[PDB]
Amino acid sequence: KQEPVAAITIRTNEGEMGVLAGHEYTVQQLAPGILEVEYEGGKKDQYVISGGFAHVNDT
Amino acid sequence: AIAYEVTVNGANLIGAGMAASGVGVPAIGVAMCFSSYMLAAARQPNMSAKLLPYCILGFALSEALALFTLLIALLELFVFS
Amino acid sequence: AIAYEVTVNGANLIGAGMAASGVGVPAIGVAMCFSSYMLAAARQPNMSAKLLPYCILGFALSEALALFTLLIALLELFVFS
Amino acid sequence: AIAYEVTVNGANLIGAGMAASGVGVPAIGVAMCFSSYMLAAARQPNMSAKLLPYCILGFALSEALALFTLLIALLELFVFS
Amino acid sequence: AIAYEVTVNGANLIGAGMAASGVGVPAIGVAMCFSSYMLAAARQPNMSAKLLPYCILGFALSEALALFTLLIALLELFVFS
Amino acid sequence: AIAYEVTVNGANLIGAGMAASGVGVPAIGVAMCFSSYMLAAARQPNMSAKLLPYCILGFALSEALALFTLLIALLELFVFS
Amino acid sequence: AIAYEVTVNGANLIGAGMAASGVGVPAIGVAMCFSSYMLAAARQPNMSAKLLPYCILGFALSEALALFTLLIALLELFVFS
Amino acid sequence: AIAYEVTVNGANLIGAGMAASGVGVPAIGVAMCFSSYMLAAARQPNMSAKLLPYCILGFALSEALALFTLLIALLELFVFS
Amino acid sequence: AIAYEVTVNGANLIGAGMAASGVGVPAIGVAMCFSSYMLAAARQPNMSAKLLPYCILGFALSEALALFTLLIALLELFVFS
Amino acid sequence: AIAYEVTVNGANLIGAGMAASGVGVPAIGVAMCFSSYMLAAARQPNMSAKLLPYCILGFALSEALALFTLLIALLELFVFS
Amino acid sequence: AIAYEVTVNGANLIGAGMAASGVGVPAIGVAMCFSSYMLAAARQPNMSAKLLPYCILGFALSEALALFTLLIALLELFVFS
């Protein structure tokens, strides 16, 4: 729930994408695979998913 | 066979344009580099500061090629007869 | 063998057209700069102000290559005989 | 060595076509600007007002080179012998 | 050095084929504008009305260069000897 | 100075090839228009008819430049001696 | 002044190559049409029947100019001396 | 006026290079069809069988234009004196 | 009229470069065939084996036009006098 | 008719320029091959290992075309008179 | 048949511009590589380090053809009489 995060990497039908602060507002299907999340402390956390939609705000 | 040597002084000035034709082609490389930097920074502003050196490099090199072509045209006239 | 110096004064003006062909090529890149800045400015309005200097710089440098070619065309005539 | 000076008068009209070939070369880079404006306006119509200053600027000065390329061939004839 | 003026009448016509080679290169720029209009309307249908003003302007002025490029070759023959 | 006029009858034909090289450059402009129509129609079938006038208009006044160029190359021969 | 008509028979076969350079300039446009048909049907297979006319229509036009570009060089030799 | 016919045998070959220069222009159109088929099947594998006819057709048409350009170059030498 | 046949032996070699210029043009097409297959594989790894046939096909067959574009220049010198 | 054979030694070098114009063309095909590997690896890093053979193969062929053109330019001088 | 060897010293310089036009042709491929790295960086920052080896590589070899293409024209003058 609204946790601070440094960066996040997603898997899509088009391929794999990376998301940083102020990333361009974009929306697209998630392809069924894994997900990588990198917090500010250099750690990482990986999550298996089943599709979905990811919305990145300009803020 | 008979041997006729000709020295065309006019050829001093034709090739100056021939190189000058290619000076504009690297300008597309210039704008290609900046276009990439713009769309990339708009995609990820945090990475902008990281991509600036590459841009400055990839620009300069393109410009350098044009410059070399230009140099020929300027080296073609004020020294040659 | 025999030696003929020839001076073709008509070649004072043939080479200007080749440079002149080169003067219009950079325009392919000129708009290519703005064409990025538009799309970038669309994909992120807030960064439109920070990508502005880069756009101006790329346009100017492309135009400088064009200008050098044009300078050859003007310099080819009003000083040469 | 012997000195043959030649003055080719027809060449005055050959270079007209030579610069003429580069008058349309910008035109691809002229319509590129309006093309980008269309795609960008579709992306964010509210931004359409903020972009057209960076369109007309990229338009005329993309057109301008053609003038600088065209002027030569028109300046090439009605003054030169 | 001896002065051999030459008046080449064939040169009245070769240049006409040069400008004519540049009458085509605007056409790709022409279709670029309508291609942009198509993909922009297919991107935003209701915007199709407000994009057409910026579509005809790129159509004529891209065509306009072709006219000037086409003008020279036609102006090169029926007036020059 | 002495004046040697020449009339090169071979120059009746060389130019015809040059314009011919420009007759193909609009052909790449044709498929730009129709490719845009295809991708725009697959993008939005309901806009298939509204964008058809521009789909035809892009070809007519693009192929027209090919016709003007071809007209030069054929006008260059069957009247000029 | 003096007047030397010259009839250069070699120019019969130079221009043949000069048009031949433009015969392939449509081919890059030819494949653009079918490339569009492919990807446009990939977006919507059900529309593949409605886009195919504009696909077939897109070839014969793009090919036609090639023939005309090819016509001159073949018109250039087997009739001209 | 006086009349000098000249038969330049070297012109039997200078055109062959020009026709040879355009043989590679369609190769971009060649790969433009297969690249499209690749990405099309990459978006819809099931349709790969239905797009293969168009792919082969476009490759063939582009190749035919290249072949005509090549035919001029080979026909320019082994028959012409 | 008088008739001067001339045999320009230097034209044996001029054309050698003229064909050679078109030897590198297909490269843009050649890499295109691979530049597609990568992205397609990045779009669909499992289909990489089924797209490979049409990845070497256009590869070697565009290179074939490069070969015949080069074969003229190499056939132009070591047989012609 | 009369028969003048001429051997132009300057034409030992002109061709070297034209081939040299085509040595830089495949350089475009160089980046097009590596660029495809970049993005295709960015889209799918795990596949980056097995897309490298295709990349090096494409770059090597494009470079081979450039090399052959360059070879003509260098073979044109140090053996021919 | 009579045999006239001619040595045109002017052709020592013309070819210099002709390769010079080929020096700018790689300059567009320069940004074709760098843009790839930029957009691939925005695609995945974490892979930025692993794609750099093909950036600096993918430029320099494209620069290598720009060097040899540039080498000839500079080697064309200060040794050839």
Q: How was this structure determined?
A: cryo-EM
Contact J13, K9 (CB under 8 A): no
Q: Does J42 touch chain A (CB under 8 A)?
A: yes
Q: Are H21 and I26 inside 8 Å of each other by CB?
A: no
Work out whether strand J2-8 and strand K2-8 pair parallel, antiparallel, or are unpaired.
parallel
F18 in Cβ contact with E14 (< 8 Å): yes
Q: Which DSSP string do the residues of B45-78 spell out, in sequence order? A: GGGHHHHHHHHHHHHHHHHHHHHHHHHHHHHTTS
Burial group, residue J60, by CB count within 10 angstroms (0-12, 13-18, 19+): exposed
What pairing do the DSSP bridges indicate for beta strands A53-56 and A26-29?
A: antiparallel
Q: Which residue in the block uniquely carries the two structure tokens 């055109």?
A: H15
Q: Are E7 and F3 in contact (CB under 8 A)?
A: yes
Measured between alpha carbons, how far is C23 from A26 in angstroms, rounded to an integer?
Answer: 39
Q: What is the DSSP string of F28-77?
A: HHHHHHHHHHHHHHHH-GGGTTTTHHHHHHHHHHHHHHHHHHHHHHHHTT
Alpha-carbon distance of D20 to E75, in angstroms, equals 12
Give the number of other Cβ atoms within 10 Å of residue E1's Cβ: 10
Alpha carbons H40 and H55: distance in angstroms, whole number: 10
| Torsion angle of C-alpha atoms H15, H21, H22, H24, degrees rounded to 10 | 150
Beta-bridge partners for A35: A47
- Measured CA angle at C80 (ends B14, E18), to 5 deg: 40
Residue J46: count other Cβ atoms within 10 Å of its Cβ. Answer: 9
Task: Please report, for chain E, the start and end positions of each structural domain, with discontinuous segments joined by +.
Answer: 1-81
Q: What region, left, alpha or beta, does residue E16 occupy, with left being phi > 0 and alpha being psi -120 to 50 degrees?
A: alpha
J18, J72 Cβ separation under 8 angstroms: no
Q: Mark out the alpha helices in H1-81 (DSSP H runs).
A: 11-21, 25-43, 48-75
CB-CB neighbors (< 8 A) of A11 in chain J: none
* Burial group, residue F52, by CB count within 10 angstroms (0-12, 13-18, 19+): middle
Alpha-carbon gap: J31 to the closest alpha carbon of chain H (Å): 15
CB C57 within 8 A of CB D61: no
- Residues K18, J20: contact at Cβ < 8 Å? yes
Tell the residue number behind the tokens 């070497």, with chain if given: I56
Amino acid at site I48 = S
Angstrom distance (rounded) from CA F60 to CA E63 = 12
Q: Are I23 and J65 in contact (CB under 8 A)?
A: yes
Distance in angstroms (rounded) separating the CA atoms of residues K7 and J72: 22
Q: Give H79's Cβ-side CA count (13 Å radius).
A: 9
What's the burial of D49, exposed, middle or buried (CB within 10 Å: 0-12/13-18/19+)? Answer: exposed
Contacts B44 to A, Cβ<8 Å: 18, 20, 22-24
Q: Is J76 helix (H, G, I), strand (E, B) or coil?
A: coil
Give the 3-state secondary structure of chain C.
Answer: CEEEEEEEHHHHCCHHHHHHHHHCCCHHHHHHHHHHHHHHHHHCCHHHCCCHHHHHHHHHHHHHHHHHHHHHHHHCCCCCC
Structure tokens at G7: 């009839």
User: Residues 6 or more apart from C20 whose CB is under 8 A from it?
Assistant: B17, C69, C70, C73, D15, D18, D19, D22, D69, D72, D73
CB-CB under 8 Å, A17 with K45: no
> Domain J1-81 carries which CATH code?
1.20.20.10
Phi, psi at G46, each rounded to 5°: -60, -25
Give the resolution to one decimal, in Å.
3.0
Which residue of chain J is at minimal alpha-carbon distance from I8? J6
CA distance J67 to chain K (A): 8
Residues in CB range of H53: below 8 A, 6 or more apart: none
SS3 I78: coil
Helix (H, G, I), strand (E, B) or coil at K10: coil
Measured CA to CA in angstroms, residue A43 lies from A6, A7, A37, I80, K68 at distances of 10, 11, 9, 72, 49
Question: Given an 8 Å threshold on Cβ–Cβ distance, is C46 in contact with A58?
Answer: yes
In the β-sheet with A34-38, what is the strand arrangement from edge to edge? Answer: A16-19, A7-11, A34-38, A44-48
- Subunit partners of chain E (3 or more CB pairs within 8 A): C, D, F
| CA–CA–CA angle K66, K72, K75 (5° rounding) | 130
Of G76, G79, G78, G81, nearest to G18 by C-alpha is: G76
Q: What is the dihedral of CA G30, G32, G36, G39, to 10 degrees?
A: 120
Q: Beta strand A7-11 with E2-8: parallel, antiparallel or unpaired?
A: unpaired
Helix/strand/coil percentages in chain A, nearest 5: 0, 50, 50
CA–CA separation, C39 and C42 (whole Å)? 5
Longest dimension (CA), chain K: 75
